[PDB]
Design a protein around this ligand. Structure first.
Ligand SMILES: [Zn+2]
Lengths: 187, 229, 286, 191, 93
C-alpha cells in the first residue's frame, strides 16, 4: 500500500519529512521482504547533502535487515568510518540495533576503531552499540576484556572527556546492569 | 556602540514606518561588528546589552566579523547574557545537549573558554523554503551560465583551434617535462622498491591534463551539432 | 549610454521577501520596488533596494499609487547610513508589461534621473535569465509614429562582489563551482538543447500566432532583420570547411595520442604493484 | 476627538482664471484648504490631509500627513494644464484610502470641481454605486458653471448619498462676488 | 532563392536589365558603391555571388517559407536534443 505514499513523500522539500519517509518505511518493510527500499535508503544516505536523512537513513536498513546479523557488518563496515561523523553515528546505531541480542563478533572486532576518535558522536554511539552487544554474554566464550575495560575507563576518564561523552558512557554502562543481568531484549 | 547612540525617535520612527507597511514584527535584538580584537564583548557592550534586555527576555545578540574570517567559511555565532544570580546553581541548565557538539565548532582556545565565565553562546540553524531554493538555486546556476546559454559555447569550441593549441603545446611541455624524470624513475624502482621518498605522484596531475585535453573531444560533438543544425 | 548592468541577487531575494511578507491576502499583484544602484560609473551596479506600497485597480489599468514622502524618508535615511548609493530606478514583479508603466516610470523620470526597468517572474519556473534591463529612452521611429517611451533590452549579469558568493555557497551546499572537466561540461552539453529548445519553442509559437493573428503594429520592420539574420546561414555546403574538419579532427588525434600514451604511463604503477605486492604478500604471508 | 482622513481634489484647468468671478479664485480655495486644514488641526491635529489634482495624468502632490508646513509650499506650482478627469480622479483617492497609517481614521474625500463633467450618466451611476457600495463620505463642491448647476448631479448625489441620518451634504455655491470661504463653511463639514 | 545553389551568373542580370556584358561590371560596382550589398565574387568565369540583403518591403512566400525552414530547424534541434539526451542522460546524467 505505502509504495506510492512513501515514493511520493520521498521527494519532499522538508528534510524532517524526508526522515519521516525512511522511519515510516522502516516498520512497513520489516522481515527483509523488500530489496528495493534499500536502493533509495543508501542512495539518500550517500547522495543527499543534509546529514539528517544520512544519519536517520540506516535505521530503516537495520530495521528491515534485522533478520541476519552476519550480513549487516559486511555492508555497514564502510559506514563505520564514513566521511562525516553523522553517518558514523547513525551507522553506530545500525550496528547497535542489528547485532543486539546476538553474539556476532563482526561488529565487536570493529568496535575498537569506533571508540577512539576526536568526535564525541562516534564515541557515544560506539559506547551505546558496544553496550547493546555485551548484554547476556559470558567472558569464557569471547574475550570481552577489551570493551569491558575501555567501557569502565570512561567513568574515571570523564574528567578529561566531553560532558556528553560521559553521559553516553554511563548511560551505556546502565544497559548491561539493567535488571541485574536477569532481563534482556529481543527483536 | 553605545546606548546614547541609539536614537529612540529614529528607532521608533523607522519601526513605525515598518508598522505602516507589511512588517508587523517587533524588535528581537541588536547586532554589531567587532573587527580585529575578536568577537568578544567589552564592558560597554555588556552594559548596553544589560540595558536593552530589560524589555525582551531573550535579547539575541549577534557579532559578525568578516574582516579576518576567510572566504571559505562564513560561520557566525549568536551570543547570550547569563544571570548574575545563577552563579550558585548550575551555569546553563539547558536540555537537549546533542546540539552542543555543533556548538563546539567555534573552539578557539582563548575567547570561548578564555572568557566563558558570565558569557555563553547559543546554537544556530538555518531554514530554506522551496521559493528560495529554486529562485536562488536557478539564480546562481544562471549566475554561472550565459544569457541564451548558447553564446559562449562556440567561443571555446572555436578557441580550441586558436588559443587552446598553445595550452596543448605547453601541456605537452609539462608532460615531457615530467617524462624526463620518469625516464630516471625505473632505475630507482629497479634498485630499491622499498619505501616512498618523493611526495609527487606524477599520476593525478597527468589525469588532470587529460581532463583538460578532453575538452576538444566533448566540444567536437558541439561543433558537429552547430554544423549539422 | 549604458552597455551593460550588474544586478546583485540581494534585490531578487528582496523579491523573495516581497513574496514572503504578503500575508496570504489574495492580491499578489505587481508590487513595485524602488531599485537602487550606482549611476556614477558607466556600468550599473545594484547593491540593495527597498519597496513602496503600490496598489492598482482591478478594471482600470491607469490607476497607480506611489509615495513621495516614504521615498524621500527611506532614501534619506538610507543615504544617511550609506551615501555611496543613490536612486536609479524601480522594478515590478509582473511578467507582463502593462500600458500604465509609462506613467509609473514617468514619475521617476521627472523627479529622478533616467530609470532602468526590470521585468521578472512571480514564479521561478522560467529557465531563462529572470532579469532584463530595459532602459527608459525615447527613440525616433522610421514609420512616422509619434515619439514615445521605448524599452530597449540592455544585457545584464548576476554577480556578487565579496560576501554574497560566500553566503550563497554556504546556504546552498548543493551547487558546484566551475569544476572544468567531465561533469560540468557534459551537463551543459546535455541540457543546452533544452535550454534553447524551451526558449525558441516558447517564442516562435506565439510569434507565428501573431504573424497571421496580429495587428496594432508590432514593429514589423525588425522582422525583416529577424528573417534576414535567419537567412544569413543558407545551409553552407561545408565544402571549404572540410580542411577545418581535418584540423579539428587532427587535434582530436592529438587528444587520442595524449590519452593512450599518458594512460599507458599511468598503467605502470598499477601493473607493477599488482604483481610485486601480491606475490610478496603471498610468499611472505605464511 | 475626530479620527478621520481628509482628501481634497483641486482643479488645475484654465477655467479658474476667468475675470467674471473672483480674481483667480485658485488662491481663494487655497485659503479654503488652509482654513479647513488649520481648523481640523485645531480640532484634531492627528488628521492627515492629502493633495492631488484632477488632471489627465494625476500626480500625488503630498502624501497623507498631519504636517501641513510643507503642504503650504506644495499648494503652489499648480501646473495649470489639462481640463478635467473624473474617473481616475475618484479612483486615485477612494482606492488610495487604504494606504493611510491610522486604520481607525474614517474615510472622507472632498473635491473642488471647476470644469463641466465629461462623463455621462452611466459613469455617474456606476461611480455613485461604487462609492455608495464602499461607503465613503463624499462631499461634492462645484465652483463655477457653464450650463445649469445641478441637472443630473442632483440624482448623482441622491443616488450617491446613503445613510440619510447625519450623512453627506451637497455644497452648491451660487454666483456672487463674495468669497467662497464663508459660503463653504456654512455646512457641518467645516468645523 | 535563399538556398539551393545561391551562386548565379550575369546572364540573368543582363537579361533582366537588357544591358550588355560590358556594363555589368559597372552595374555591380555601383551596387557595391551604394552600400546595400556586400557581395564579393571570387569567380574566374563570369558568375554572380551575393551576400546579405534587406527586402525592406514585404515577402509572404518568405513568411510561409520562414515558417517551413523555421519549424524544420526547430524540430531538428529538438530531434538532436532528444537523440543525444536520450541515451546521454541514461549513461551520464
Ligand atoms: Zn573596538
Amino acid at each position: 500500500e505505502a509504495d506510492a505514499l512513501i515514493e511520493s513523500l520521498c521527494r519532499d522539500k522538508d528534510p524532517i519529512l524526508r526522515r519521516s519517509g525512511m522511519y515510516t518505511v522502516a516498520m512497513a518493510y520489516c522481515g527483509s521482504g523488500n530489496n528495493k527500499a534499500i536502493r533509495r535508503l543508501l542512495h539518500v544516505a550517500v547522495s543527499d547533502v543534509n546529514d539528517d536523512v544520512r544519519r536517520a537513513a540506516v535505521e530503516s536498513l537495520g530495521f528491515i535487515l534485522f533478520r541476519t546479523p552476519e550480513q549487516c557488518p559486511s555492508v555497514v563496515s564502510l559506514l563505520s568510518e564514513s566521511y562525516n561523523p553523522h553517518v558514523r553515528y547513525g551507522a553506530a546505531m545500525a550496528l547497535g540495533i542489528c547485532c543486539a541480542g546476538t553474539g556476532n563478533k563482526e561488529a565487536i572486532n570493529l568496535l575498537e576503531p569506533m571508540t577512539n576518535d576526536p568526535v564525541n558522536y562516534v564515541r557515544q554511539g560506539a559506547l551505546i552499540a558496544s553496550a547493546l552487544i555485551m548484554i547476556q554474554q559470558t567472558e569464557i566464550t569471547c574475550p570481552k576484556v577489551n570493551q569491558f575495560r575501555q567501557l569502565y575507563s570512561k567513568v574515571i576518564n570523564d574528567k578529561h572527556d566531553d560532558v556528553m561523552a560521559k553521559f553516553g558512557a554511563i548511560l551505556a554502562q546502565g544497559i548491561l546492569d539493567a535488571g541485574g543481568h536477569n532481563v534482556t531484549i529481543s527483536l | 556602540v553605545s546606548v546614547e547612540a541609539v536614537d529612540p525617535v529614529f528607532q521608533a520612527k523607522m519601526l513605525d514606518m515598518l508598522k505602516q507597511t507589511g512588517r508587523p514584527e517587533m524588535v528581537v535584538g541588536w547586532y554589531h561588528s567587532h573587527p580585529g580584537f575578536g568577537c568578544w564583548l567589552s564592558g560597554v557592550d555588556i552594559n548596553t546589552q544589560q540595558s536593552f534586555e530589560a524589555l525582551s527576555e531573550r535579547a539575541v545578540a549577534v557579532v559578525v566579523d568578516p574582516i579576518q574570517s576567510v572566504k571559505g567559511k562564513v560561520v557566525i555565532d549568536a551570543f547570550r547574557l547569563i544571570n548574575a544570580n545563577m552563579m550558585v546553581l548550575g551555569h546553563e541548565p539547558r536540555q537537549t545537549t546533542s546540539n552542543l557538539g555543533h556548538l563546539n565548532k567555534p573552539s578557539i582556545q582563548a575567547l570561548i573558554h578564555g572568557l566563558n565565565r558570565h558569557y555563553y553562546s547559543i546554537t544556530i540553524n538555518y531554514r530554506k523554503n522551496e521559493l528560495e531554493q529554486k529562485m536562488l538555486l536557478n539564480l546562481h546556476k544562471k549566475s554561472w551560465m550565459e544569457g541564451l546559454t548558447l553564446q559562449d559555447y562556440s567561443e571555446h569550441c572555436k578557441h580550441n583551434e586558436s588559443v587552446v593549441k598553445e595550452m596543448l603545446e605547453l601541456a605537452k611541455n609539462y608532460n615531457k617535462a615530467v617524462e624526463e624524470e620518469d625516464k630516471m624513475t625505473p632505475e630507482q624502482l629497479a634498485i630499491k622498491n622499498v619505501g616512498k621518498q618523493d611526495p609527487k605522484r606524477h599520476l593525478e596531475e597527468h589525469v588532470d591534463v587529460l581532463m583538460t585535453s578532453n575538452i576538444v573531444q566533448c566540444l567536437a560533438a558541439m561543433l558537429d551539432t552547430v554544423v549539422f543544425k | 549610454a549604458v552597455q551593460k548592468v550588474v544586478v546583485h541577487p540581494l534585490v531578487l531575494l528582496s523579491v523573495v521577501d516581497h513574496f514572503n511578507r504578503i500575508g496570504k491576502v489574495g492580491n499578489q499583484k505587481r508590487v513595485v520596488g524602488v531599485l537602487l544602484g550606482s549611476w556614477q560609473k558607466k556600468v550599473l551596479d545594484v547593491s540593495n533596494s527597498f519597496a513602496v506600497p503600490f496598489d492598482e485597480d482591478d478594471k482600470d489599468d491607469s490607476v497607480w499609487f506611489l509615495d513621495h514622502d516614504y521615498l524621500e524618508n527611506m532614501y534619506g535615511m538610507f543615504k544617511k547610513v550609506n551615501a555611496r548609493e543613490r536612486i536609479v530606478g524601480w522594478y515590478h514583479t509582473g511578467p507582463k508589461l502593462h500600458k500604465n508603466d509609462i506613467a509609473i516610470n514617468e514619475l521617476m523620470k521627472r523627479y529622478c534621473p533616467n530609470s532602468v526597468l526590470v521585468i521578472i517572474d512571480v514564479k521561478p519556473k522560467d529557465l531563462g535569465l529572470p532579469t532584463e534591463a530595459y532602459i527608459s529612452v525615447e527613440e525616433v521611429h522610421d514609420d512616422g509614429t509619434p515619439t514615445s517611451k521605448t524599452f530597449e533590452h540592455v544585457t545584464s549579469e548576476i554577480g556578487a562582489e565579496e560576501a554574497e558568493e560566500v553566503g550563497v555557497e554556504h546556504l546552498l551546499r548543493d551547487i558546484k563551482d566551475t569544476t572544468v572537466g567531465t561533469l560540468s561540461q557534459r551537463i551543459t552539453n546535455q541540457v543546452h538543447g533544452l535550454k534553447g529548445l524551451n526558449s525558441k519553442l516558447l517564442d516562435i509559437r506565439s510569434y507565428l500566432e501573431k504573424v497571421a493573428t496580429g495587428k496594432l503594429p508590432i514593429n514589423h520592420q525588425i522582422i525583416y532583420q529577424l528573417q534576414d539574420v535567419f537567412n544569413l546561414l543558407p545551409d553552407v555546403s561545408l565544402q571549404e570547411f572540410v580542411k577545418a574538419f581535418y584540423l579539428k579532427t587532427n587535434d582530436q588525434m592529438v587528444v587520442v595520442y595524449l590519452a593512450s600514451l599518458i594512460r599507458s604511463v599511468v598503467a605502470l604503477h598499477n601493473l607493477i604493484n599488482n604483481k610485486i605486492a601480491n606475490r610478496d604478500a603471498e610468499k611472505k604471508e605464511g | 476627538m475626530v479620527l478621520e482622513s481628509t482628501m481634497v481634489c483641486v482643479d488645475n484647468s484654465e477655467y479658474m482664471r476667468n475675470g467674471d468671478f473672483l480674481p483667480t479664485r485658485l488662491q481663494a480655495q487655497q485659503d479654503a484648504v488652509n482654513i479647513v486644514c488649520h481648523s481640523k488641526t485645531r480640532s484634531n491635529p492627528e488628521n492627515n490631509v492629502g493633495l492631488i489634482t484632477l488632471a489627465n495624468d494625476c500626480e500625488v502632490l503630498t502624501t497623507l500627513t498631519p504636517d501641513t508646513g510643507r503642504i503650504l509650499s506644495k499648494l503652489h506650482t499648480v501646473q495649470p494644464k489639462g481640463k478635467i478627469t473624473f474617473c481616475t480622479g475618484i479612483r486615485v483617492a477612494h482606492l488610495a484610502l487604504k494606504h493611510r497609517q491610522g486604520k481607525n481614521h474614517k474615510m472622507r474625500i472632498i473635491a473642488f470641481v471647476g470644469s463641466p463633467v465629461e462623463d455621462n450618466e452611466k459613469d455617474l451611476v456606476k461611480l455613485a454605486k461604487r462609492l455608495k457600495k464602499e461607503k465613503v463620505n463624499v462631499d461634492i463642491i462645484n465652483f463655477g458653471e457653464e450650463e445649469v448647476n445641478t441637472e443630473k448631479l442632483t440624482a448623482f448625489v441622491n443616488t450617491l448619498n446613503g445613510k440619510d441620518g447625519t450623512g453627506s451634504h451637497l455644497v452648491t455655491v451660487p454666483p456672487g462676488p463674495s468669497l467662497a470661504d464663508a459660503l463653504i463653511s456654512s455646512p457641518i463639514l467645516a468645523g | 532563392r535563399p538556398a539551393n545553389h545561391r551562386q548565379l551568373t550575369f546572364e540573368e542580370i543582363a537579361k533582366s536589365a537588357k544591358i550588355t556584358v560590358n556594363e555589368v561590371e559597372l552595374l555591380v560596382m555601383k551596387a557595391l558603391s551604394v552600400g546595400l550589398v556586400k557581395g564579393s565574387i571570387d569567380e574566374v568565369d563570369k558568375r554572380v555571388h551575393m551576400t546579405w540583403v534587406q527586402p525592406r518591403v514585404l515577402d509572404l512566400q518568405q513568411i510561409k517559407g520562414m515558417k517551413d525552414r523555421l519549424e524544420f530547424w526547430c524540430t531538428d534541434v529538438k530531434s538532436m536534443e532528444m537523440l543525444v539526451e536520450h541515451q546521454a542522460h541514461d549513461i551520464l546524467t
